[PDB]
Each structure stands twice: as C-alpha cells, then as structure tokens.
Amino acid sequence: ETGIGTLIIFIAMVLVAAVAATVLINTAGSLQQRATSTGSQTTNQVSTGLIVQSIYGM
Amino acid sequence: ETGIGTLIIFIAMVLVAAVAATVLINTAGSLQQRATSTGSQTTNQVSTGLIVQSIYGM
Numbered sequence: 001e002t003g004i005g006t007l008i009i010f011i012a013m014v015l016v017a018a019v020a021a022t023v024l025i026n027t028a029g030s031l032q033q034r035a036t037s038t039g040s041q042t043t044n045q046v047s048t049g050l051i052v053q054s055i056y057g058m
Numbered sequence: 059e060t061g062i063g064t065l066i067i068f069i070a071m072v073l074v075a076a077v078a079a080t081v082l083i084n085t086a087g088s089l090q091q092r093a094t095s096t097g098s099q100t101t102n103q104v105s106t107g108l109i110v111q112s113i114y115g116m
Contacts, residue, residue, distance in 0.1 A: 003075045
C-alpha cells in the first residue's frame with residue numbers, strides 16, 4: 001500500500017530540511033564576528049591620533 | 059475462490075493506511091506549537107531593551 005512508501009520518504013524529507021537549516025545558522029554566526037570586529041576597529045582608527053606641540057634645535 | 063481472499067487483505071490495507079495518516083497529523087501538530095512560540099518570543103526579544111539616562115555621583 002501507499003502508506004509504507006509515504007513514511008520512508010517522510011524521514012528523508014525531514015533530514016534534508018535540517019541540512020539547509022544548518023547552513024543558514026553557521027553562515028550567520030561566521031558573519032557576526034567579522035561585522036562586530038570591523039565596527040570596533042574602525043571606531044579606534046578614526047579617534048586615535050598624534051599631535052606635535054613644538055620643535056626645538058641646538 | 060479469489061473473492062474470499064480479496065476481502066481479508068482489503069481490511070488490512072485500510073488499517074495500514076490509517077496508521078501512516080496518524081503519523082503525519084501528530085507530527086504537524088507538534089511542530090505547530092513550537093513554530094508559533096518561537097515567532098512570538100523573538101518579537102519580544104528584539105523590541106525590548108533598557109536605556110541609561112544620566113549618572114550622578116556624591
């Protein structure tokens with residue numbers, strides 16, 4: 001009967017959907033750390049600087 | 059005759075098809091409550107926050 005064949009494919013459908021879910025989570029986690037670090041590094045880059053007061057010679 | 063044997067297997071075929079039907083309904087009902095709760099919890103998670111106005115010392 002059709003009942004047996006339906007159950008077999010059902011298991012396969014669940015496993016496939018889990019794979020595509022894993023890709024999206026892993027990619028978002030990788031891009032999270034890069035975007036956070038870039039923001040913090042740029043903030044330090046703009047604000048920081050050195051200034052010359054006076055120059056003397058002998 | 060073939061008529062007797064056909065009826066016996068017919069009963070078995072109906073019962074098997076009912077089993078596979080039950081699996082699909084029960085699984086969909088279980089996934090329904092999880093997906094609904096996840097959506098509502100995330101909406102509250104993003105919107106909610108605390109803000110600092112001013113800090114004084116003595």
